[PDB]
């Protein structure tokens, strides 16, 4: 009814420990969600065009041309790690657990409140807010996944990460098909590169509406909505990283001479000439057996063209890579391709008291060593006459195409049947948790944006809207915009995310890396004197595991 | 007890024929294993560094820098074909069988003998050997695979291939994490290329010890150890090779004119103009239908950058390839990338009476025709105007990067969704049998070092050690090395490897290739007048099978 609550606030994470080292981690997340009535009650097909920016030669990477259907609905998205765990919970998970499973998801809307705003004609602004007890909130659960999948974490538009801070839903929109051509150029190109937007292909048109595709529930102040429990079928997520490169696979060479005194200058020596050694190599025309030429079971990681942009029907897009750059751990400035960069606002980890539109940014460096150091790569002749001469070796400094800033590694691909790689680690708090699998016939082996992928399906998107609150002067025949009473809603969203995790075991004599609070990061986890909070990112795959 | 044997010597291979053309091949292998007490009773973290060798410009491929934990334990490894089969058994297998399955593995240690050495003070050396009836041999079976996987076949350090020749175990060591950077150079580079060893990443440290990870059994002269039967879950291994290239897939063109007289100069002719023919091609802008342009179901084999070295956290390593070079069968000198080269000593096939540290070497040429002949490759313009002109074709002789010894094929990768390839053939006697699968999330489609791969796990590594035999003057507080009575052990190792194989069938009118003894190789299988034995390599995939 009007004066009866329809739900309870719960934001507790429970760790129920099972037998055999397994734990059920049920994270509860409760938020107060504020929603305004849509700017327009219609669906719009809006073409965003920034040909001015890309008309500058060399700016083709800044292309934003696209077409989107803007809908009157808003999306309630909780597909981010920060929506579910605080730094203490994440510390417990990443320190005491070795693998993580995604078990189930539930969400519900309760304690719906709808208020109308009456603004007076007095010259200084003044307004009052009245409860509209008969107003309704339109809630649609796309449990069949009919609507396009538009996760908000990629735009930093999920629910807020603070239980005590009210959050908002994101206005929903989806991509409409378009055709676009953009010939790349550079500073110094003469003429106007081909840069046109060709329109839309009629055979690819797909105009979706929530009304025609999903059942819609009208919730009054005394109503509540529950989606029901959804159960995932994803793969386990490892909370351990691998450190072994191809150089550290298998049996090391026997050292016939060992150091007689400790110290950094004292080295063990194999004691056998490199061309007189025993072993197996894939180089059938050389007698040298070294750490770089000896046979290994397979290849850890792969090389791909980095900062390569491929053009397709809808324009250019960067070629993704599964693994981050090698050497970003020895030198943090080397983080670039494959090291995801997260930019977020005050709702999602940035200092809440900051002013301005500049977001808080961080580049994530994974502990796994599956990356590549292209500056140390090279190609050489099949003859393999050592030491190699100039014409028989292609080095990373050799120009490709006549460009001194482009080398073969930029266009180099080593993906093959022997490539072995890991899934992307969870990124806390701004990383996505689960992502829908592509509906293609042949599917990618992994996604670079979420550690869990939906093989069959994952829970339907939740859409909310303020039902039209018409005045007495509504005329559907009029071409002017619908006249509505200014209405807004505040409702409580509660979600339950259930994981299954395995407790880690100590395999080595030495201790391992753990996340800990210290003097440097001590104040990143507590509020300031005025209430300013923040959530800094945390690494997940802290403990190491042996690859081979 | 002291005077009671605890096992029997068995080195027989049994072929028990089943119904429906299947045979159980149980190979028994018995060896006398001699073990010396470890040089040191401690674990050492030894850094092998050869910066002197790689400081020579162009010698970066000879990098041996690495770090290893040297343990006081020795590894008993029987993961090689020669440990289980003699040339007659291998001939029977490769001639009468079409596929091979790895069923089970057992090993055991018995008839343990421990002897102490007493050396006299007399000026001419003289010594006696006494049985230490109360001395113990420490045996650890890592059935849980907690320790790093270090197969010895890659170093030619498995058990000997001769039943009547006593063998030794290999001292065990494993790779410790390290960071290394090496900028490639060539003869003619000016300056000192960046060449440093950066140390160890604390987050990747993994110090393993047998004592803290595996149960240890103390075997006295009257004790024996049995691991128990382990059962594999690997894929079948084909003993047949494929000969069909993309040029030999599907229906050949109809010959409207056939030769009227036999002879090498008389050819059949299609009789239709290449641009007037019927068929399907993937080239949508050409009317030519030829043997090189006609559509095929998929691609057999693939091209990859050969003799490409990729650098990662721990230095440079050669990029592996699944298939060997094409044309190595028409010209044995073309064997290079992908054709494994085996180097071994007198225990593993080399003439036992040879003197010197030079190993016996051979490059393996597989009968399967999945390789590539890069000298016959080329790229040309999408326009496809024939005959192609200079600027519209990139040939294998065209310099890439300005280097006349490097062409596009050196950096060329054609692996894709249409690539079809075979697993590596068994290499007798020096090839590995089974290999552990990588613990990565995404796993390689095959391993280039063993025909069988351990999906879940494969039998734990066996470690042996001589238990410390202290003197009366032991003082654990002393910083000097432990003083031990010089002790060594001789024990009998018996293993049983069970395979399941299918008998081959005659599918064609003509006979097929079989391994046979002849005048040229007659004396490669019998001892010399002084007992000198050898085991030359044998090819496995002799018979052909149709790919399509």
């Amino acid at each position, epitope marked *: 009814g009007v004066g009866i609550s329809t739900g309870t606030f719960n934001n507790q994470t429970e760790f129920k420990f099972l037998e055999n080292g397994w734990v059920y981690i049920t994270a509860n997340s409760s938020r107060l969600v504020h929603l305004n009535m849509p700017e327009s009650e219609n669906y719009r097909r809006v073409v965003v065009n920034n040909l001015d920016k890309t008309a500058v030669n060399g700016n083709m990477a800044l292309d934003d041309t696209h077409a989107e259907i803007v809908t009157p609905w808003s999306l309630v998205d909780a597909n981010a790690w920060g929506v579910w765990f605080n730094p203490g919970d994440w510390q417990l998970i990443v320190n005491t657990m070795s693998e993580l499973h995604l078990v189930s998801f539930e969400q519900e809307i309760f304690n719906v409140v709808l208020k109308t705003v009456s603004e007076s004609a007095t010259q200084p602004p003044t307004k009052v807010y009245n409860n509209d007890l008969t107003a309704s909130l339109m809630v649609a659960l796309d449990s069949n996944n009919t609507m396009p999948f538009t996760p908000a974490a990629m735009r930093s538009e999920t629910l807020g990460f603070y239980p005590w801070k009210p959050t908002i839903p994101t206005p929903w929109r989806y991509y409409f098909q378009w055709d676009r051509t953009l010939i790349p150029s550079h500073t110094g190109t003469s003429g106007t590169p081909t840069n046109i937007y060709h329109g839309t292909d009629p055979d690819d048109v797909q105009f979706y509406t929530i009304e025609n595709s999903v059942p819609v529930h009208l919730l009054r102040t005394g109503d509540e909505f529950a989606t029901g429990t959804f159960f995932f079928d994803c793969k386990p997520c490892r909370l351990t990283h691998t450190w072994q490169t191809n150089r550290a696979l298998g049996l090391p060479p026997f050292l016939n001479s060992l150091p007689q005194s400790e110290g950094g200058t004292n080295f063990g020596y194999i004691g056998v000439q490199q061309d007189k050694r025993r072993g197996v190599t894939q180089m059938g025309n050389t007698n040298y057996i070294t750490e770089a030429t000896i046979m290994r079971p397979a290849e850890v990681g792969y090389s791909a063209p980095y900062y390569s942009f491929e053009a397709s029907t809808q324009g250019p897009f960067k070629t993704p890579i599964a693994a981050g750059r090698g050497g970003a751990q020895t030198d943090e400035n080397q983080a670039a391709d494959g090291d995801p960069r997260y930019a977020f606002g005050r709702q999602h980890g940035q200092k809440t008291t900051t002013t301005g539109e500049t977001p808080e940014r961080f580049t994530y460096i994974a502990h796994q060593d599956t990356g590549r150091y292209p500056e140390g790569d090279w190609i050489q002749n099949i003859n393999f006459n050592l030491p190699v001469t100039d014409d028989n070796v292609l080095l990373p400094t050799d120009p490709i195409g006549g460009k001194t800033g482009i080398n073969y590694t930029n266009i180099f691909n080593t993906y093959g049947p022997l490539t072995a790689l890991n899934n992307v680690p969870p990124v806390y708090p701004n990383g996505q948790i689960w992502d829908k699998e592509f509906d293609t016939d042949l599917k990618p082996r992994l996604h670079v944006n979420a550690p869990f992928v939906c093989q069959n399906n994952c829970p339907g998107q939740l859409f909310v809207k303020v039902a039209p609150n018409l005045t007495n002067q509504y005329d559907p025949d009029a071409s002017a915009n619908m006249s509505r009473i200014v209405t807004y809603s505040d409702f409580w969203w509660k979600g339950k995310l259930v994981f299954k995790a395995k407790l880690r075991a100590s395999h080595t004599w030495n201790p391992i890396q753990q996340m800990s609070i210290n003097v440097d990061n001590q104040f990143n986890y507590v509020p300031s004197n005025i209430g300013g909070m923040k959530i800094v990112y945390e690494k997940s795959q802290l403990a190491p595991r042996k690859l081979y | 007890g002291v005077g009671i044997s605890t096992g029997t010597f068995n080195n027989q291979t049994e072929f028990k024929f089943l119904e429906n053309g299947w045979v159980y091949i149980t190979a028994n292998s018995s060896r006398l294993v001699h073990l010396n007490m470890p040089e040191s009773e401690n674990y050492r973290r030894v850094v092998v560094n050869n910066l002197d060798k790689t400081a020579v410009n162009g010698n970066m491929a000879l990098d041996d820098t690495h770090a290893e934990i040297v343990t006081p334990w020795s590894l008993v490894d029987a993961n090689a074909w020669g440990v289980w089969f003699n040339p007659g058994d291998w001939q029977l297998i490769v001639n009468t069988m079409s596929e091979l399955h790895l069923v089970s593995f057992e090993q055991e240690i018995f008839n343990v003998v421990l002897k102490t050495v007493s050396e006299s003070a007399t000026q001419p050396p003289t010594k006696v050997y006494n049985n230490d009836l109360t001395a113990s041999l420490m045996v650890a079976l890592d059935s849980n695979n907690t320790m790093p996987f270090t197969p010895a076949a890659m170093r030619s350090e498995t058990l000997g291939f001769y039943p009547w020749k006593p063998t030794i175990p290999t001292p065990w060591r494993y790779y410790f994490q390290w960071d290394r950077t090496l900028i490639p150079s060539h003869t003619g*580079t*000016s*300056g000192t290329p960046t060449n440093i060893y950066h140390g160890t990443d604390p987050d990747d440290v993994q110090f393993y010890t047998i004592e803290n990870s595996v149960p240890v059994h103390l075997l006295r002269t009257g004790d024996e150890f049995a691991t128990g039967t382990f059962f594999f879950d690997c894929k079948p291994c084909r003993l047949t090779h494929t000969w069909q290239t993309n040029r030999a897939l599907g229906l050949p063109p109809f010959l409207n004119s056939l030769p009227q007289s036999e002879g090498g100069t008389n050819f059949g002719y299609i009789g239709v103009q290449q641009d007037k023919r019927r068929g399907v091609t993937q080239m949508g802008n050409t009317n030519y239908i030829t043997e090189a342009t006609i559509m095929r179901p998929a691609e057999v084999g693939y091209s990859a950058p050969y003799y490409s070295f990729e650098a990662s956290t721990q230095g440079p390593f050669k990029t592996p390839i699944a298939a060997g070079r094409g044309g190595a069968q028409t010209d044995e000198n073309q064997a290079a990338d992908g054709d494994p080269r085996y180097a071994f000593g007198r225990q593993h096939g080399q003439k036992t009476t040879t003197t010197g540290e030079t190993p016996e070497r051979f490059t393996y040429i597989a009968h399967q025709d999945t390789g590539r002949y890069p000298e016959g490759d080329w790229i040309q313009n999408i326009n496809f105007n024939l005959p192609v002109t200079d600027d519209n074709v990139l040939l294998p002789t065209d310099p890439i990067g300005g280097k006349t010894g490097i062409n596009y094929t050196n950096i060329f990768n054609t692996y894709g969704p249409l690539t079809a390839l075979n697993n590596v053939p068994p290499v007798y006697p020096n090839g590995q049998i089974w290999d552990k699968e990588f613990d990565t999330d995404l796993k390689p489609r095959l391993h280039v070092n063993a025909p069988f791969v351990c999906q879940n796990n494969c039998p734990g590594q066996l470690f042996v050690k001589v238990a410390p035999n202290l003197t009366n003057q032991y003082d654990p507080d002393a910083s000097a090395n432990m003083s031990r009575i010089v002790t060594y052990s001789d024990f009998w190792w018996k293993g049983k490897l069970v395979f399941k194989a299918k008998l081959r069938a005659s599918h064609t009118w003509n006979p097929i290739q079989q391994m046979s003894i002849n005048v040229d190789n007659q004396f490669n299988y019998v001892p010399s007048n002084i007992g000198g034995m050898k085991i030359v390599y044998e090819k496995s995939q002799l018979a052909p099978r149709k790919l399509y």
Partner: antibody
Amino acid sequence: EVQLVESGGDLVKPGGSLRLSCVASGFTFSSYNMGWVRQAPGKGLQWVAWIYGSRSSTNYADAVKGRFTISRDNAKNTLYLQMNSLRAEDTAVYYCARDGGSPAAYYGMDYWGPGTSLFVSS
Amino acid sequence: QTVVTQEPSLSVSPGGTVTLTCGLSSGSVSTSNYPGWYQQTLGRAPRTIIYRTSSRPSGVPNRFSGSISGNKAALTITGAQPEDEADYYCSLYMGSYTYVFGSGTQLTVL
């Protein structure tokens, strides 16, 4: 945009010490390898010191090894060159140098400061 | 010790083409040396003309071109203007993290 300003150059007697300070603006200071070059009065440019990497690894020319120390403070966006046991041969104009390649270094001085003169005389 | 040799002095008429060369007494200059060219006027700090043997910083006129000729680095000024008269210094990356500088070439526009 990218600006480098050097200061601390002053007359100093032989055998003394002096710290040159280089203030950088218009760019992320910690993301670029920095260095100190020097030009003697009437002579050509000579590389003095280089600081590179997130670990602040340092390399020095043979003429200043053991005597010069190159450091950086990214909080202050400052580069410090501390010279000890100064000689008459160290008298010169010292230029701040910034490499423009953060993830792929140009291995060359992308930006230069106005320079600070140091005179060593008894 | 590494020594970089370049022409002590060079001359060019207005609107002409001149080439300044930078070599090594022992060895050859390649793209692995990342040759850099810097321009210095009297009483002013050096200005970067070329980096990575071909790249001129934004604002550098196109008349300056960097290349590798023979076993040396080459800086070519085409249509040389009066303001191009200055001391041009060549920097070679000598591996590891060591840099070397040439003696310098005094280019005067007639």
